[PDB]
């Protein structure tokens, strides 16, 4: 059978502003013979565990995966890593209804909006492992938190993008400080 999958992680983040650096690292067991890292939209690959990008470009954004080989056996491929280039478009607006300071137990709706031409939004809360996407396809979208708790408090930023290039996102909105008491 295949060897167990390696991990594939981006640091400092998978949401990389244009011209900022990022490392993609494939991590399998120590001492494996060969690594293969590949971008899902490329017809080529690299036979190294690390891809360092000194300055993020639109062409580098996309889905990536990696594998390793040990004693002739290839591993299962890693979970897909989505590398996003941010700062590609003007930032959207981000607001909270009824407001950013709210009591625990009720709802709070984080809302984003951009000009017509962008149909998707994603919310990123500082410190979270990943952004929150939204099934909405419209120039504005709502992200209701049905029951807010103190755990939902934090700094949120919203991004807008188009279904035509789902890995090219806008500059983040101004931050919203959600304070749940």
């Amino acid at each position: 059978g295949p060897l167990p999958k390696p991990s594939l992680q981006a640091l400092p983040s998978s949401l990389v502003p244009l011209e900022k650096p990022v490392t993609l690292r494939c991590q399998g067991p120590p001492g494996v013979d060969l690594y293969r890292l590949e971008k899902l939209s490329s017809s080529r690959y690299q036979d190294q565990a690390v891809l360092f990008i000194p300055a993020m470009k639109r062409s580098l954004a996309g889905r990536y995966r990696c594998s390793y080989q040990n004693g002739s056996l290839w591993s299962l491929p890693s979970d897909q890593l989505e590398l996003v280039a941010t700062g590609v478009f003007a930032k959207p607006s981000l607001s909270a209804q009824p407001g950013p300071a709210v009591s625990s137990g009720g709802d709070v709706t984080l809302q984003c909006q951009t000009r017509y031409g962008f149909d998707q939004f994603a919310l990123y809360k500082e410190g979270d492992p990943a952004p929150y996407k939204n099934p909405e396809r419209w120039y504005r979208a709502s992200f209701p938190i049905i029951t807010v708790t103190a755990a939902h408090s934090g700094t949120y930023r919203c991004y807008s993008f188009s279904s035509r290039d789902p890995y090219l996102w806008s500059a983040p909105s101004d931050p919203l400080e959600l304070v749940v008491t």
Partner: antibody
Amino acid sequence: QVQLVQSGAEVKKPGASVKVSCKASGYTFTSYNMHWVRQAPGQGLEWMGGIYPGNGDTSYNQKFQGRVTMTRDTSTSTVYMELSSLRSEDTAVYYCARGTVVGDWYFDVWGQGTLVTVSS
Amino acid sequence: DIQMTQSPSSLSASVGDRVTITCRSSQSLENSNGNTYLNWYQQKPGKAPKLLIYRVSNRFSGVPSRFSGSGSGTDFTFTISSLQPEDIATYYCLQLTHVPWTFGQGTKVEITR
């Protein structure tokens, strides 16, 4: 490949308990709350409660308060539901279903269900 | 608790017919912030339920356009504009506006042929 894989069917005596597992894969585990919904044979759906995997906070339907415990193991992306003092009325298929922490498009991915028969 | 009353409890319709299902809540589903969380699920036999509509009228990703939802307050509707043979299922409304979350008793949909 978003998936919720549950443990196999169970048979338990009245008065005993059952513990069902729900292993998640293909997504960021702490981005979705995990709820449990049950269905008695030939009947409708009933909401039991949910857990937030990030910190283990729970919120149960008062009808099960004191007899249901939901827990999670972050390292294996698994959520457990334990229901105690089982009676005939607890014979049901028990499903786990994910609910986005931010958003309201709840229960977009469900587990395959686990039949629990309560009988001596 | 909020009680969701679904009607009819079952129906049979021919391929291409318009099917309308109603769900009535015992009390208002407009919360203190003016919002309503009401979703519709489709459960085919031997399978888990599937999310079709969320937030009263939003089709979830990949859901065919024949499925729609509408309503406000205590009165909600789910519509199949042109019934297909593969649409045979029990459909359920769910209110996520007040805890405990409660489902309608379901509408079983069958085909007349």
